[PDB]
Design a binder for this molecule. Structure first.
Ligand SMILES: Nc1ncnc2c1ncn2[C@@H]1O[C@H](COP(=O)(O)OP(=O)(O)NP(=O)(O)O)[C@@H](O)[C@H]1O
Ligand SMILES: Nc1ncnc2c1ncn2[C@@H]1O[C@H](COP(=O)(O)OP(=O)(O)NP(=O)(O)O)[C@@H](O)[C@H]1O
Ligand SMILES: [Mg+2]
Ligand SMILES: [Mg+2]
Ligand SMILES: [Mg+2]
Ligand SMILES: [Mg+2]
Lengths: 578, 575
């Protein structure tokens, strides 16, 4: 898009200046950074400033910085291959006078297409820096006013930490337009809400408010002031200053990987200023600063209003909190309180763990969960039937990270987690219920022994009477430390996309505990016809099909769909005549 | 203090690491001299001079390389490598002169150290001398007979002159080294064992390379190169025989990142910057020639070895190659291997599939699965197999993508058996017989479309691809199959999210039925008797839900499926 930018930004026509001030300030950051390890880098031009002149006589607008500038080699690359082209929205011809420490002064000219670089016939005028000169077009020929620049600078120079002067009448002399003092250095009581929002937009754009922000000052082992932000959306970051001097935004180990979405500034008066980037990154004080940034980020996330947290924060950054529980051992408890999940308590609303706890029964000491690939799968599962009926709430885990997240959290507020698809599910039992159960177990013993010893031999660990089923005839339960259906699934996907066929593992190719419902009509009939004739194949063929459907119902992959299907066929044939 | 009596087996390797280091220092100062004329001021020469001393019990390894500054001496020297010098000595004296600093002396007694300015001052001009005060238990190294064979043993591929202090019965330096590079020699004269020894000199891998190629490039650019294929999953750039770098990451395309070798060009600029030389026009011409010659090498590998060994290791690289490299796609397509229904385990080439194709067969049929077993027991391939058509099986994630980037092989288009478009030719007697049976089952076709499976299927038709299977779900040509439903939705669940309202995930499929199948015949038989019957209603849904799993898709509602199954199980027992 050559000339297809002028019309798409006819709204933001005045931003040409903001884009130039931005560039000037960046150039000033770079040379100031070089001078921290080179005592005579400022020798060409002592001051670090932004100067703007209106040359209405010649139709020129001058933006002069005393920054790093550009070399002969840098002029042909950087100025060619928003941004710098923003100048062409108000200028037909663009000329930049520039002087770098490692080369002589040159003048770069361009209409918009081709280019040419010549040495400035005047010699070295700036000493160091760059002057952006714009041959201002007809409709833009009004910026060269004694108040237009004055007012535009005073709104687009906000948050520029270098002094900006304009050549003005009063005698023609420079006049300071901005305030050099950083807003992160100002006390919180004085900084307005709009100012914090405007700051967020100034270094990340997007023209929408941050989700949240925190402005703090640190006391103790290390001293620094900081402003941190939570963006409104997960993008699909942190600027470090030492004694008010910009150093870098390339330090990625500032925040742990789970809090990578956080944006902001850190200004430390304790870090070494007159040192290299490699030395500062591995500095011991940085690890202290980091621990403080994480805690203050979590303070900020915690402060988000209840509804907004669930409806907005959780939706974008819930996974990050889940990864946080796994990574951040020292902040685990704070993070566990930030977790939100779906549960049987409501069809869609998410719940905290504290809210789950408050809803618990007096003698319930396990936080129950069902892990699936979708809510629907998890909620229509055979394992939640009795729990739900008797009023136990079950958390539903529908993302693959969820199970590693729970698996990394031994307890929550004195309560241990229990996977309903696994051994360890308990119901408080009255003496009447308890005894009525023991009678059932003995009544169904000839069916349990038949299933284990012949019908389903070498398929199941054992066959028992279940206490977790309502509507379902049977289900497959994994051992307490074994793999569930959801884990088998997650692992098989991982072993296919990356792994080298982990078929003969340990607790992957193992048999499960086959639990039956003594009140289900079909199991009742099955007990009857087995005691009469144990070698009745019609019952034996029916046990296999029932077991294989339980496999699917339980969340496990079927070992051979061809055979299963062929059984279903035979069943359907002897269910009619076909 | 756990290396002295173990590292031894390789016990005399202290010299190899010291020769290697000297050569690196020599390589580095020469690299600086290309842009800087004042680099070789202290010394004009670039040598390695080893010297023996019986009386003082000292062994000096002297180089005229870059040298080390005082700051570097403290950091670099200390904790394979430089430490190996403590296997034969218990005190290493390092004298070093660098262009940016005065001459210093570093000494270490394996534990502690010290670094002071040399009392003698500048005696080296530029470089380092490593003095070894040998142990009296392993001081055999100061013997002329021993040192002469030891330097030749570890300087075969060192391209700087190595000298030793010797005499003829007149003391002077002698050359134990031929600095003409292996790549610059004529291809005929270089022995096979020399190419192998060269591979281990820079890879430090011990084992042989799987394959190698040594060629001289001609035409648009001229260079000499030796490229290697390793046995299990870095290119050195030289200009005018002068080492430049090995940090040019894009020398080879990403798919061929396993290739190791050297490139020596007399057409590239020498006295220029690394940044500049990386973007030079001739380098891209070299890059294109490296790929083609690499592929030439991969093609020269014998048949069995290719499938048994190359394919097992780098097969995935070739598949990624077909996708990445548009220019060499046709060359790469011929390197692809897949399993097929021709043999239970053997993999086949596409040319081999083509040679087996039927007279008037225009398509290469493929079935994609999570494993071979699901692919080979798919309803989709039933009649193709029976009629003698071969089906390629795609059991890996990349496969789907690989074939997709290949619009044709040798004039043939690929056909997914899970998708509409499988062809079976027929005579007028077969075409009319089909059109008769098709109109015979049409009442059932509309009953399944408008009653039984009203909003679950796109259309119900009579299949020509089944033998044993009663039915199957067939995908649209512009739709997703079962395997692609996975690949996509096991990444929307894994990474993506909110893909319920996707492109075509909740899209209905074509429900094909087998007219010769007992259950489909008796379903047609009973569809005219009542129709309002809930037994055939259940029969058809249960069969449709079983066809789904059987077709590679997933069951909408598993519970409802279970509930159906058990009502049928009620009939088969209590009745
Ligand atoms: N005043 C200046 N002094 C020195 N170099 C400059 C100046 N203005 C522009 N440049 C060079 O031109 C390049 C592009 O500038 P610009 O198009 O504004 O993008 P940017 O500032 O790098 N990033 P953005 O903030 O998105 O515009 C910069 O990387 C500089 O190297
Ligand atoms: N003769 C020498 N001249 C200049 N520098 C040297 C010399 N010998 C060793 N060094 C320095 O000491 C460092 C450590 O050497 P060494 O322990 O052999 O590892 P390395 O040379 O970096 N790589 P490698 O030898 O493959 O393990 C090197 O990085 C060199 O900078
Ligand atoms: Mg910019
Ligand atoms: Mg069958
Ligand atoms: Mg070494
Ligand atoms: Mg039921």
């Amino acid at each position: 898009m050559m000339k297809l930018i002028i019309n798409s930004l006819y709204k933001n026509k005045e931003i040409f200046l903001r884009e130039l001030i931005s560039n000037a300030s960046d150039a000033l950051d770079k040379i100031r950074l070089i001078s921290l390890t080179d005592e005579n880098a400022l020798a060409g031009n002592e001051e670090l400033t932004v100067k703007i002149k209106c040359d209405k006589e010649k139709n020129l607008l001058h933006v002069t910085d005393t920054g790093v500038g550009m070399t002969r080699e840098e002029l042909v690359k950087n100025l060619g291959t928003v941004g710098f082209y923003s100048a062409f929205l108000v200028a037909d011809k663009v000329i930049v006078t520039s002087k770098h420490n490692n080369d002589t002064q040159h003048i770069w000219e361009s209409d918009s297409n081709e280019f040419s670089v010549i040495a400035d016939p005047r010699g070295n005028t700036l000493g160091r820096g760059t002057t952006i000169t714009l041959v201002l077009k007809e409709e833009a020929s009004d910026y060269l006013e004694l108040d237009t620049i004055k007012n535009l600078v005073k709104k687009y120079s906000q948050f520029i930490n270098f002094p900006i002067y304009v050549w003005s009448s009063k005698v023609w002399d420079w006049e300071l337009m901005n305030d050099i003092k950083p807003i992160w250095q100002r006390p919180s009581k004085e900084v307005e809400d709009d100012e914090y929002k405007a700051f967020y937009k100034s270094f990340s754009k997007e023209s929408d408010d941050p989700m949240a922000y925190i402005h703090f000052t640190a006391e103790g082992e290390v001293t620094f002031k900081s402003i941190l932000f939570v963006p409104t959306s997960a993008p699909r970051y942190i600027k470090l200053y030492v004694r008010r001097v910009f150093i870098t935004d390339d330090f990625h180990d500032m925040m742990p990987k789970y809090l990578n979405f956080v944006k902001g500034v850190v200004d430390s008066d304790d870090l070494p200023l007159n040192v290299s980037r490699e030395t500062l990154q591995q500095h011991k004080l940085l690890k202290v600063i980091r621990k403080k940034l994480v805690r203050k980020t979590l303070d900020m996330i915690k402060k988000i209003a209840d509804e907004k947290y669930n409806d907005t924060f959780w939706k974008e950054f819930g996974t990050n909190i889940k990864l946080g529980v796994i990574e951040d051992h020292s902040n685990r408890t704070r993070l566990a309180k930030l977790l939100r999940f779906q549960s049987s308590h409501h069809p869609s609303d998410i719940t905290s763990l504290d809210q789950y706890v408050e809803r618990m029964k007096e003698k319930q000491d396990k936080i129950y969960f069902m892990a699936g690939s979708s809510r629907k799968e998890a909620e229509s599962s055979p394992f939640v039937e009795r729990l739900l009926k008797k009023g136990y709430e079950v958390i539903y885990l529908t993302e693959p990270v969820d199970e590693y997240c729970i698996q990394a959290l031994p307890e929550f507020d004195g309560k241990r987690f229990q996977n309903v698809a696994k051994e360890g599910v308990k119901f408080d039992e009255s003496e009447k219920t308890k005894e009525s159960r023991e009678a059932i177990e003995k009544e169904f013993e000839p069916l349990l022994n038949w299933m284990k010893d012949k019908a389903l031999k070498d398929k199941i660990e054992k066959a028992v009477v279940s206490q977790r089923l309502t509507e379902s005839p049977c289900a497959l339960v994994a051992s307490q430390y074994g793999w569930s259906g959801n884990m088998e699934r997650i692992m098989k996907a991982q072993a296919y996309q990356t792994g080298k066929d982990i078929s003969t593992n340990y607790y992957a190719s193992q048999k499960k505990t086959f639990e039956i419902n003594p009140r289900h009509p079909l199991i009742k009939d099955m007990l009857r016809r087995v005691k009469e004739d144990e070698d009745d194949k019609t019952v034996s063929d029916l046990a296999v099909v029932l077991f294989e459907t339980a496999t699917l119902r339980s969340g496990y992959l079927l070992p051979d769909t061809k055979a299963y299907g062929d059984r279903i066929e035979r069943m359907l044939r002897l269910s009619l005549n076909i």
